[PDB]
Amino acid sequence: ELRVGLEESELWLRFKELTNEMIVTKNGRRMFPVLKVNVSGLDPNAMYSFLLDFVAADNHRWKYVNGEWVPGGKPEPQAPSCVYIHPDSPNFGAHWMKAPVSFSKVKLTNKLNGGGQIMLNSLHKYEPRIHIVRVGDPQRMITSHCFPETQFIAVTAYQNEEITALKIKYN
Ligand SMILES: CCN(CC)c1cccc(O)c1
């Protein structure tokens, strides 16, 4: 049975309880924490690609007011459907299952300035989502897992001084 489990869920839940924030820049910023998953129940012999995209959680944007995140207005038009291909793709199930899969090089940005970066809208909440694509498959089978522990608000600068402090502490 295919199981994709979140690594360092306790680390994520510490950010989530403050409301997690990720910096977006012109040139793209790496995530902290990095999304990491363990995989079991792939066909070790088969080849797969691993994809990561970011699903918009709400039909409104967010604002940090009086040390509280609150609904902050109507959403902007959905960000372009950007997909990041794990650099180990394509690869054997055995490869994906032998060690955690880390999305350490993915970069979040607020400008379509190329370079395999993911465009997000400032002050919108996103949920990371991993896709396993079997290669050479005439049915193009894909599996999708969402990671609710890893939800964050995209920000051009940290709003919550506790998040700024956690990011320095655990990084
Ligand atoms: C947040 C909990 N804490 C100790 C369990 C921790 C700190 C850093 C990395 C990590 O995987 C965990």
Present the secondary structure layout.
Blueprint: E1 3-6, H1 9-18, E2 21-23, E3 29-30, E4 36-40, E5 47-56, E6 61-65, E7 68-73, E8 84-85, E9 91-92, H2 93-98, E10 101-102, E11 107-109, E12 118-119, E13 125-134, E14 142-146, E15 152-155, H3 161-170
Parallel strand pairs: 2-15, 11-12
Antiparallel strand pairs: 1-4, 3-11, 4-10, 5-8, 5-9, 5-13, 6-7, 13-14, 13-15
Helix pairs in contact: 1-3
Residues 8, 10-11, 14, 170 line the site of 3-(diethylamino)phenol.
CATH superfamily: Transcription factor, T-box
CATH architecture designation: Sandwich
Oligomeric state, counting identical vs distinct chains: monomer
Counted up, domains total 1
| Backbone shape | globular
| Beta-strand residue percentage | 35-45%
CATH fold topology: Immunoglobulin-like
Give the helix tally: 3
- What are the secondary-structure elements, in order, as H or E? EHEEEEEEEEHEEEEEEH
Give the total of beta strands: 15
Which CATH C-level class is it?
Mainly Beta
Biggest beta sheet attributes: 7 strands, mixed
For the termini, the CA-CA separation is 34 Å
- What is the radius of gyration computed over CA atoms, rounded to a whole number of angstroms? 17 Å
- Helical content stands at 10-25%
SS-derived structural category: alpha+beta
Distinct compounds present:
3-(diethylamino)phenol
